[model samples]
Target: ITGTSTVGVGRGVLGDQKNINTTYSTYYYLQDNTRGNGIFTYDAKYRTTLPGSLWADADNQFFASYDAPAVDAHYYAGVTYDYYKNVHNRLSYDGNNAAIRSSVHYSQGYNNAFWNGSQMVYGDGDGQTFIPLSGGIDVVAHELTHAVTDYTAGLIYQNESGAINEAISDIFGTLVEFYANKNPDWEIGEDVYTPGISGDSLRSMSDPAKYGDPDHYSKRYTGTQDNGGVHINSGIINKAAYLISQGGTHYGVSVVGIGRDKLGKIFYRALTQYLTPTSNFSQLRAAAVQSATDLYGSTSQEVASVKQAFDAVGVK
Candidate 1:
């Protein structure tokens, strides 16, 4: 369903339209000397650069239409589907081949994106600080992954469960970013915001400490913002998974060897196969440990680290 609206000039003052006109630019050069895959024609927009005219108004409404984002969404959806299918041997989003639909340009200047209980909704940002929200694979994957979380954990969206829901999406969002490697760096929203600003992503999987604030889990893990800081406190679990998977010292604590793919599979399997609506961090930790054990072995190092990461976050 496509819809349109216009900002009236009377009641609302449109300040700084200057930022809206200046477009973000970048070059798309594939590395490793490998050419295009035969899946679709090589459109430069698919990678690092977005077209100047990507956002334009037609018939008095803000609109930008590109099948590429939808195609990319579908492609990643296929990736998620196949990842779960091969790893967990599951079906579609509902375990029974349910059709998943995605919508682009959901609302004008809507700064955020969401999976509205069914379809994915994207936005064209204020254009001052950001562009299309769907430009980045991480953003798209983030929204779609919310659907997966809703279908599985059905996280209570209020307390620790809400934080888990947010963390799971951020974790998978980064995983999807690394999996795609669409941008040169494995940062999220590189294409959605200005290069100067996109460099500072909403959250950092590499170093959550860079943002310098509480609720990052490295800090006090405050519980008073954005659905009990679900989106904020998620940095705790995200960085935990990242630290464990990447094998690094986080907040002066050392983590052992934990592979990225294995970490992702553990979380995915647990969320889909073991979690429930009322599941909290403790339950998530236990179920994810169980998932790792079920997939690998009860005494596997992967399971141990999976459990340790959750416990390290004060989940006990």
Candidate 2:
């Protein structure tokens, strides 16, 4: 809804206090006009609808228990937008400052979140398994990155191509987490996942094997489940990405760390320039190699680390 731009204070599902962008109409709505075209958060209200009621508050203050997810979802969307704009010099997910939209409290006891090709959707998890997915900034960035992938590479979401797509989301998602500089770690969704457990996450870029995901190409899952293991096999690529940023010796092949900035630059270049819909792991390796060569020269340590990271992960 169109209204005067405003700011509100609230506590996220993680019980962290933060400020959310709002729009002042008859009531305060979660519509941020500061970044991109706008950032809008809606209330799913236990339904599988798209962008339900524009989260409206009677007052600018949003400190209710039910407002937790919306607060985080809206706040993180802005953070994700800032990551792309400030760090990558890209306007928004589509590089056009498109309006960022999200809906929290989607479906009752839902345990997942996703980008449904248009907007981000978050579930108020089944408490035990998850509290509210939007509570995790990396989770928010991961889903939004899917929209970026759609606009750029358009990688097919199946098999090897799908795995690359998933890894790209994880890579940037973690980068955005680091960019936020808030309890940053290589672990994904650790904040919102398993409230009963501690020090765990849905996946780990640093060590995919921590959750039985394949860190090497040879160990990739060949089953038909999970869309040819899109999430499962993504580990191989995520591991390579991790090694490139933070030097590690995997399978006796050592990679000299090139750091996160170069890692993001190389991957973003490849995703936007070289990758295609059906690009597989080997194709991704080629794209990254060429991307590094393009950005940092073939003789640069950045390019060498790219080659070595892929090699260490058995991408060749």
Candidate 3:
């Protein structure tokens, strides 16, 4: 819609007040044109249909409970966009000014969010398992990072490659969360996960095994479920990412921390340059090592830490 850019005040799913970029024609709509080409958000209206309608508000103010998810979805998409552009020097998910879109309130009591190859979709959680997933910056970043993976690595969505796909999302998602500096932590979906509970998350990069996810490659699941355990086996790589950012000793192997910025640089370079559609765990190890070497010399501690991080996760 051709409309003047306007600012709207809104409270997110977590009750955080912020300003959102909106468009005003007859009614205020959740369409932000400030970043790249655009960042548009839609309301799913508790139904299964996608991108239900452009989210509209009469007063250009979003504070009602029903508007919480939309606010966070739109706000987080902007944050994730800025992260990629400012930190990685990437324009959007495709290295082009791709229009970022999201749909919230998708289905009643829905408990997950995902990227449908083109756009983002978030579920208003069952409340027991989660709240509106958009409330979690990491969750929003995680889903959008899938689009990044699809555009770049195009890692196959099965077996080890699939796990790498999942891990890359988790890794960058955590980085985005930290980059935003909003109560940053290595936990995924912690902010909106189980509001009744504390110190728990859907997954933990710092300690993936805490949620029954394998932190070691030897313990990876090889079953047919979940696209060959993509989510389950992602823990191995997740742990490696955590170790690379925050040095830790695991199973008698030690990794020297190279910090998050460098960690992101190496991984981003690998994803964009070295990784292939069929790359597996071993291939990912080589990619990361080469990426670190490229960014920080073959004899640098960054390269050594990259090797040790993968080795610690038993990704040899």
Candidate 4:
């Protein structure tokens, strides 16, 4: 078994904070969809000592003394807050006046950053292949999107549910990246890797087949690490949405076209309102089509294109 632990001193506004053992301590069940079983459980387990605010307060003694790439962390946290509020009508992580905490420079030059249920953690890049994890809006939003997923569908992190989990987040994360104008293209994690690398991004919605191998979906595809490659196979769903949004032939196949507004709204509505924790690609397709019909006329090109995009990606 492998385990880890951390220690630090709290300061300033968050210094006086004490662990509130209310609803926050409950262990969240991360179900295993493949077996229809609760593989294990996890929780926010909110620690008493950490940054506790919407945005990092530089006046805090910790913020003042530490060189933890505070600006990037603060900027992305603010961006995430704004993206949810403006785009999805979400107030914050919990939607109940919850304070968002972010810890930057976690570990010495580590290459990955993640949200451990309650707070966000960042790493100061290893100085070679990758850059600081806090440097990208999409990366930050991606982790924050996990929190959103937890609150929304609570998608099981295996099989189709896992893919859906990654896909929805990638969708919103791309939207946030575009909304932030961090880069011209909606590529995720472009800012996290070093410049001039061909195989930098973990996945690409513009062309999903270019990563790792060129197989669409195989039996072996669902089990190859990287969270079962949910972030990778998610390319199929991601590109389908992109095709719907941009109105183009997917895989050089003839296609109907959905306007960007209709496409985004349909998927967003299905994701936020209709889907459950165990939703799969087929379920998502059906829901998107229904959402399209409801949001637009059933006979409209927009609705037709939404279905067509799914077909193009072999999701049906």
Candidate 5:
């Protein structure tokens, strides 16, 4: 929609107040022209149809109960965009400043969010399992990182590659949360997950075993379910990532903490340069080591931690 860029005040699904970018013609549309080409958020209207309609407002104030999901989706997309641009020097998911887009309230009680190849689609949860998934910054970044993966590594969404793909999303998602200075933790989807239950998340990076996800390659799932248990097997890589960033001992192996920024730099370099569609756990270990070597030299502590992190996770 052609319009003048404007700002709007809104409350997110978490009942937090924030400002969102809008476009004003006759109606205020959720077309954020402030970033990239733009960050456009649409209303799915509780239906299965895509990008149902561009969210519009009579006034530039979006405090209505119905507007909560859109506000967060739109606002968080901007934040994720800023993270990649400022922190990684990448323009967008494509590294070309492509317009970022999202749709909220996708289907009734959908209980999940995903990147549909071209754009992001977020679901309004059943109120028991989840609320609005976009409310979680990690969840939003998790979905967007899929786009980043598709454009870069193009990791096949099956077997070990799929698990690698999933872990990459989780890794960057947590990093984005930290980058924004939100309630940063190595937990995924904590804010929007199980509103009724306090202090739980969809998954844990620090301890994937908390949710029955395998934290070691030796304990990996072999079943075909979940595309060879991509989510379950991602635990191994997630644990390695958590270890590299925070330092920990697992299965009698210890990794020296190298901090978060190095963790991201190594992984980003590997994802864009070394990882392929069929890369497995061992290959991922090599990629991480090489990425660290590339950024911090072969003899650097960052390189050693990368090796130790993978070793601690039994990725050898």
Candidate 6:
């Protein structure tokens, strides 16, 4: 909808107060025009229908208990857009300044969020498993990164390629968290995972094995379920990403830390230039090594560390 850009103050799902981007045209709407083409948020009204309506508030201030999810969804989408533009020089998910959209409060007690190919959708969690998922910056970025991968690598959504797809989202999701510098860590969905628990997340990149996820290729799940265990097998690549950013020794193999910035550059280059739809773990290793060589030199520490990270995870 056409409207004048405005700012609104609201509380997030985690009870933190923050300013959110909004639009005003007769009524205040959760539409931010400051980033990319626009970042629009909607209220799902605890229903299964997508994007129920453009969130509206009478005043430019939004602090209602019901507004928490929308506020975070809107704010985090902006943060994600800023991360891509500032850190990567990428316009948006498609590198074309595409409009970013999200819907929150999707279905009662819903417990997951995902990219529906064109836009983002979030579930107001069952509260036992999670709260409003938009409260987690990494989760927001993770779902949005799926769109980025779809636009670039187009990795197939099954088997090894699917696991690579999941891992790519996790990698950039953690990078975006670090870019924000808000209690950042290598864990995914820790901020909004379980209120009753502490120091636990939906997944852990630093040690994927912490959540029973495999950190080595030999431990991969070769099953017919979960699109060939995409989420479970992603641990192998997630561990490699963590080792690339933070040096570690795993299964008698050691990796030298090249740091996060270089790690991101290598992976981004590989996703944009080298990877194909059906690329497997072995091919991903080659892509990362070649990407590191392109950014650094073939004999540089970056390249060496990239190789060692993959080797440590038994990707070769």
Kindly report which residue pairs in candidate 5 clash with one another: none
Residue-level lDDT tens digits of model 6 in 1-316 = 7989988999998988999989999999999988888999999899988878999999988788889888999998999899889888999999999999999999999999999898999999999999999999999999999999999999999999999999999999999999889799999999889999998999999989999999999999999899999999999999998899899798988999989999999999999999999999899999999999888999899999988988888888
Candidate 4 per-residue C-alpha lDDT over 182-233 given as tens digits, one digit per residue, 9 for 90 to 100: 6535466777676457556756767666565222333225665876767666
**True-structure Cα RMSD, model 6:** 0.8
Off by over 4 Å in 6: none
lDDT of 2 by residue, 1-316 (tens): 8789988999998888999889999999999999989999999999997889999999888789999999999999999999999988999999999999999999999999999999999999999999899999999999999999999999999999999999999999999999999899999999999999999999999999999999999999999999999999999999999999999799999999999999999999999999999999999999999999989999999999999999999999
Comparing candidate 3 with candidate 4, which one achieves the higher lDDT?
Answer: 3
Count backbone clashes in candidate 1: 1
* CA lDDT for candidate 3: 0.94
lDDT of 4: 0.61
lDDT of 5 at 154: 94
RMSD of each: 11.2, 0.7, 0.7, 10.5, 0.6, 0.8
Q: How many backbone clashes does candidate 6 have?
A: 0
lDDT minimum window of 10 residues, candidate 1: 30-39
At residue 118, candidate 3 shows an lDDT of 81
TM-score of each: 0.71, 0.99, 0.99, 0.74, 0.99, 0.99
The sequence of per-residue lDDT tens digits that candidate 5 reaches over residues 1-316 is 9999999999999999999999999999999998889999999999999888999999999999999999999999999999999999999999999999899999999999999899999999999999999999999999999999999999999999999999999999999999999989999999999999999999999999999999999999998999999999999999999999999799999899899998999999999999998999999999999899989999999999999989898898
Write down the lDDT of every candidate, Cα atoms only.
0.57, 0.95, 0.94, 0.61, 0.95, 0.93
Q: Comparing 1 and 6 by lDDT, which wins?
A: 6
Worst 10 residues of 4 by lDDT: 35-44
| Tens-digit per-residue lDDT, 28-131, candidate 3 | 99999999989999999999888889999999999999999999999999999999999999998999989999999999999999999889999999998999
